[PDB]
Amino acid sequence: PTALAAAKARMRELAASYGAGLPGRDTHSLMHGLDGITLTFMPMGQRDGAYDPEHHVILINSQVRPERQRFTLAHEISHALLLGDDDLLSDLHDEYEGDRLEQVIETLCNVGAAALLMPAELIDDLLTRFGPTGRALAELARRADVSATSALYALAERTAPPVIYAVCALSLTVRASSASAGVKYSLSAGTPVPDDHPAALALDTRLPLAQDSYVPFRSGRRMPAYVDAFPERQRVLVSFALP
Template sequence: MRELAAAYAATLPGLDTHSLMAGLQGVTLTFMAMGDRDGAYDPEHQVILINSRVRPERQRFTLAHEIGHALLLGDDDLLSDLHDNFEGDRLEEVIETLCNAAAAAILMPEPLIAEVLTRFGPSGRALAELSRRADVSATSALYALAERTQAPVIYAVCAVGRVDVGPGEAEDERPAGKALTVRASSAAPSVKYSLRPGTPIPDDHPVAVALDTNFPLAQDSYVPFRSGRKMPAYVDAFPERHRALVSFALPVRASEPGREEV
């Protein structure tokens, strides 16, 4: 699916909204109110529909996702393999995952990610730069960057929000009100840990300090797992628009097969 998407993107005159459509002959693009849906591809009428009421960056990723649907429907071999191996709801889940992978490959091509990592390293700044240059959400950039990072690194997008009570926790074990929490997280393939969304960030942690002062901060600290465990890490926090884009570089020994959420 990534190969299909990358080949498609290579033929485009640009990656702006209308240039993204240039490779789909006969397909039109329509923006309209769609309620809770972000978009849809109607192969019968050759039209891609995009919700006009969502954020521009979301519209753009949705457009690339729907282009992924069109590419998939045009590849008989891949489509046949999917129907041979999956069915029902699971088939739909796999197709949606593949179309997200296609969208990432179109909007964040390998050369761009390689350039960002070469220039900024696996850092919070790299996450911000990829999001800005690809014009995608920080969450979309996070997953793409993590997948292509060789070093043992956990990436996270942190922002102020309500602290959720985890399974088995009493209400009085977490502070009431709002706090800085993890909104999204993903780790490099070599890392077996991930950060659960909703994980609180302590007030004295470098991520919180960077957000409070609005200055980037990089120093030795720790990963604040929700379980209370503190794993040593080099923290690079880049504040941007009321959120912090973060990388936690782990010791090499933390790089082990498998993955668990702490």
């Protein structure tokens, strides 16, 4: 189809290679796959991590918390992977150039990290066991050890039916949100969340609930849907399933 869309597709595959040659996807595993490359953690200020290709060396900020350290790595690997490919890296200078080309890149490294941390197979494995549910999300994130928001988007891209996924924290407030396939009813951040809503009941009752209800659209209009909430340390993850 479009360039980016096919470009995205490729950058997905490359991950699939790199890490198909791996024993899982914990941090240290992703490091051992580094085919003769210098990998160093130090303090880099506000810099998360940079990849110097001529010294074949990755740098990750030792200061930042672990999760992003892990993410940064996947992202900067994807940096690595890319430049490793000419047929792709070429296609890019064919429909893009300038800062454009830069902004595009980093979005792919992002797309990269995505896949490289959360395999297309760990997701379907979960969707299969728990369905498209707040629960599923809660696991993938745990199991993958990634950010509530990272899963959110991953989980959705690989979902058949109309369904919305949403993270929630107390002020409630939607924090992030994503919708599968061809659902064009969107749910913003900031969107407040009523105390009567099943999602809430589940937080100060740290109790996994599952029942019908609606999408608490901030435009007031209650759209009906099946909801499955899974609460945890300060947040509840939530799957609205549109009929």
